[PDB]
């Protein structure tokens, strides 16, 4: 018995014994009606280690616990550069909105205080629809989790004062349907420095502890105390080659004036994950810079028909 946890739902599947990661993943995506499968994965945690279900491996053969309800979390593994230009289906847009809002509220990704207020105002518009002073009276947001605790702890303001500031901006969002408000939330969130960045502990050749960030834009090297501003960045289209051999990675820039960057990473399983994230992020970087495939063109036409079908019922 396999339990699948999405950002807003829990499903149970009667998984076959001789089934591989691909079979379970495809079933989940079909059940959800999700066609942009390339962004997503099935994640699990064992003995303090985050891992993804391998598509070419048997589900039961994985290092996951042999607990009665074998559980995976369906989550986005890859992120678009501009969600407003790339995410086609409403289901995909909504799952990204939920996941990213959770990363902001639980402080997985940093957010300046002013952005947390503006983001909360779009989350309120998405959840409640248009602000209406007859309905949304003072105290209507008292039970909502609106801001990261880090932000609340930086100011001498009451919950009512935070609600008032959020409500001012919520009132400015009149006219945004749920999908429009959730997409405006993603448009703000996707410009945060930590958005979509996968961090890994590495060392340079002199032993200096650093972090590698793998993201939709390229590769980035950080001092461990500052995950916001890379010391050096290598955009995907500026990398000539990435080599890996015996725990050592080498990033070779296309620009000869930029030095080759070598670093080490201690865990083989993590190194395989770093390489997988490099290959697929580089592939997605190239794909979004070329004209839509016929499959994407048709997916957009179908999403347009679905949006117009739902709009006819409301009007």
């Amino acid at each position: 018995t396999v339990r699948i946890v999405t950002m807003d739902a829990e499903m149970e599947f009667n998984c076959e014994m001789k089934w591989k990661g691909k079979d379970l993943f495809d079933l989940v995506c079909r059940t959800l009606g999700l066609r942009e499968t390339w962004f997503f994965g099935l994640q699990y945690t064992i003995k303090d280690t985050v891992a993804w279900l391998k598509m070419d491996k048997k589900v039961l053969d994985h290092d996951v616990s042999k607990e009665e309800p074998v559980t995976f979390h369906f989550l986005a593994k890859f992120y678009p550069e501009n969600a407003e230009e790339e995410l086609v289906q409403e289901i995909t847009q909504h799952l990204f909105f939920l996941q990213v809002k959770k990363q902001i509220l639980d402080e997985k990704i940093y957010c300046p205080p002013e952005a947390s207020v503006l983001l909360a105002s779009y989350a309120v518009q998405a959840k409640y629809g248009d602000y209406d002073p007859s309905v949304h009276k003072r105290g209507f947001l008292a039970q909502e989790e609106l801001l990261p605790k880090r932000v609340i702890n930086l100011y001498q303001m009451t919950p009512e004062m935070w609600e008032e500031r959020i409500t001012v901006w919520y009132a400015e969002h009149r006219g945004r349907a749920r999908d429009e408000a959730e997409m405006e939330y993603l448009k703000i969130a996707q410009d945060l420095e930590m958005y979509g960045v996968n961090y890994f502990a590495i060392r340079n050749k002199k032993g200096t502890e650093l972090l590698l960030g793998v993201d939709a834009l390229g590769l980035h090297i950080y001092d461990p105390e500052n995950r916001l501003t890379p010391k050096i960045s290598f955009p995907w289209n500026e990398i000539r080659n990435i080599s890996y051999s015996d725990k050592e990675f080498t990033i070779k820039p296309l620009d000869k004036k930029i030095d080759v960057f070598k670093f080490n990473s201690s865990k083989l399983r993590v190194n395989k994950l770093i390489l997988q994230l490099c290959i697929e992020n580089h592939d997605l970087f190239m794909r979004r810079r070329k004209a839509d495939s016929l499959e994407v063109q048709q997916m957009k036409a179908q999403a347009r028909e679905e949006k117009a079908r739902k709009q006819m019922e409301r009007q």
Partner: peptide, 23 residues
Amino acid sequence: PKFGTHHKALQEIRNSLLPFANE
């Protein structure tokens, strides 16, 4: 630019919060 068309609102929010900073 960072935060696209929301710079004006972000700066106004920054100004509204400033008097209450813990420091």
